[PDB]
Design a binder for this molecule. Sequence first.
Ligand SMILES: N=C(N)NCCC[C@H](NC(=O)[C@H](CCCCN)NC(=O)[C@@H]1C=CCN1C(=O)Cc1cccc2ccccc12)C(N)=O
Ligand SMILES: Nc1ncnc2c1ncn2[C@@H]1O[C@H](CSCC[C@H](N)C(=O)O)[C@@H](O)[C@H]1O
Length: 221
Amino acid sequence: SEVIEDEKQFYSKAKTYWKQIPPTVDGMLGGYGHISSIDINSSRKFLQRFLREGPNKTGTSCALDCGAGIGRITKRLLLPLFREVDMVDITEDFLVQAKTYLGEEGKRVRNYFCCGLQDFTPEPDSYDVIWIQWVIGHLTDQHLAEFLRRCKGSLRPNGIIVIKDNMAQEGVILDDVDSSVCRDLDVVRRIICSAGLSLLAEERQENLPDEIYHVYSFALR
Ligand SMILES: N=C(N)NCCC[C@H](NC(=O)[C@H](CCCCN)NC(=O)[C@@H]1C=CCN1C(=O)Cc1cccc2ccccc12)C(N)=O
Ligand SMILES: Nc1ncnc2c1ncn2[C@@H]1O[C@H](CSCC[C@H](N)C(=O)O)[C@@H](O)[C@H]1O
C-alpha cells in the first residue's frame, strides 16, 4: 500500500509495459531467458516433494498457471506432471502465442483466461496445484491477499498454492518502470496469513546470477 500511490496508474502502467514486450522466453524473463532451465529444474524438485512424498500427497490431475505468459512454466513444469492445465494472463498477445509455443502438449490446456489476477476467481475445488510465479509484485497487497484467499477455496483436497517470486532482503522496493513492487519475506508472509493460508515449505533458489534479486518458493494451503 505504501509504495503504490495511484492504484489505477499502477495497474495501467504495468499493462502498458507488457503489451510492449516480445512474446518470447527472454521477454518473460526480462533478458534472463537462459536461467529458465535452472528455474524449472529447481521448481520440479520443490514440487515433486508434494506429489511423491506422503502422507497427504497432492493430486496430479489439474493445475492452474497464474501469470502464465506464453506458457514457459506450463510447457516444461506443469504439463509433464499434470493431466490438465489452465492458464491466466493479463496480456492477450501472450495467450495467443502460447498455442504455438506449447506445441503438441498444449492440447491438454483446457482453459485460457485473459484478465488480471485481481479480477480472476478460480473455480472452487478444481485444482491440485495453483502455480504463481513472478507476478505477485504486480498486485496491490489487498488484491494479492484476496486473490490468494480465492485460491484457497479453489483447491482440491491436499492441494497447494506455490508462489515463486523475487524477494527483497529488507523492506519493499517499487519498480516504476514496469510498475511492480518487490517485497521482503516478512511482508509477503503477512499477506499469506491475511489470506488464511498456512506455510508448508520455503526454499531459496540457488545458482542464480549474482546481480539479481533473491528468489524464494512458498508452498501454501
Ligand atoms: N546489470 C546490472 N547490474 N543491473 C543492475 C541489477 C539489476 C537487478 N535486476 C533483477 O534482479 C531483475 C528484477 C526485474 C525488475 C522487476 N521485477 N530480476 C530478473 O530479471 C529475474 C531473472 C529472470 C526473471 N526475473 C524476474 O524478475 C521476473 C520479471 C521479469 C521482467 C519483469 C518483471 C516484473 C515484475 C516481476 C517480475 C519480473 C536488480 N537487483 O534490480
Ligand atoms: N496483474 C496481472 N495479472 C495477471 N497477469 C499479469 C498481471 N500483470 C502482468 N501479468 C503477466 O504476468 C507475466 C509476468 S512475466 C512472465 C512470468 C511467467 N509466470 C514465467 O515464469 O514465465 C507477464 O506475462 C504478464 O503478462
